[PDB]
Amino acid sequence: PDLTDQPLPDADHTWYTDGSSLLQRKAGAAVTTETEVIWAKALPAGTSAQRAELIALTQALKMAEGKKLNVYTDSRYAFATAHIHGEEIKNKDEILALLKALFLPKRLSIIHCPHSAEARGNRMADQAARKAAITETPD
């Protein structure tokens, strides 16, 4: 309940998450900066894009324990869900995970994104997610 949708001015990290589910059905998740991949995994057998997106976000939050984080998702679902903390339900597994992860950072901004930093960072994250998915066989 310190959680804003617009950037913190004083942030140590500005991270960009993605989690595609691919055509061909393959699933990657990733966390990056504007220019460098931090964390990337392929996900269990053909899992949904919503589950990958949340995983990628829960994981950004985990790794930002005690830091000041701006993080960008492209997922309306992952952004919306995270912002309505204050509450049969689908992706329960991944949502509880996300709900506890929220409390780890010292400052948190979870921002939505559709050659500026935002465009490049989102791009970077989708590349790495869509590349840990294709060129990699799950666990």
Binding site: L3, T4, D5, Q50, R76, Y77, A80, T81, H83, I84, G86, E87, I89, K90, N91, H112, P114
Partner: protein
């Protein structure tokens, strides 16, 4: 009074994973033009301005939302006057409630309940 019933309803579309919601200026506009917004929820002190701008050499016209000039107006006022053309009922709200506060702090003070699921690809 029932600010909280509507935003609660809005939040439930998220929480129930319906996909029948939108937020922010771009998704909401885009959704409005597909005939997809049933209720349009807007923060009463919404800060966004709608600028109508001229394109240099041309006698053409370009609109712009921000936070040579032809006409300027608050998007809220623009919504109030023009929302019925997407139909689309309109609910202006405030942040003096907890539901309304989260809407503004977390969803940018602008969003909608949707008739059907939209992509935003």
């Amino acid at each position: 009074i029932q600010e909280k019933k509507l935003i609660g309803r809005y939040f439930d579309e998220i929480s129930q994973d319906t996909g029948k919601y939108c937020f922010g200026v771009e998704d909401t506009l885009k959704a409005l033009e597909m005939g997809a917004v049933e209720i349009l929820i807007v923060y009463e002190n919404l800060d966004i301005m709608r600028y109508v701008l001229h394109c240099q050499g041309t006698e053409e016209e370009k609109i712009l939302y921000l936070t040579e000039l032809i006409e300027s107006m608050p998007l809220l006022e623009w919504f109030a006057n023009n929302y019925k053309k997407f139909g689309a009922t309109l609910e202006i709200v405030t942040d003096k409630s907890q539901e309304g506060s989260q809407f503004v702090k977390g969803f940018g003070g602008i969003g909608g309940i949707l008739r059907y699921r939209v992509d935003f690809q």
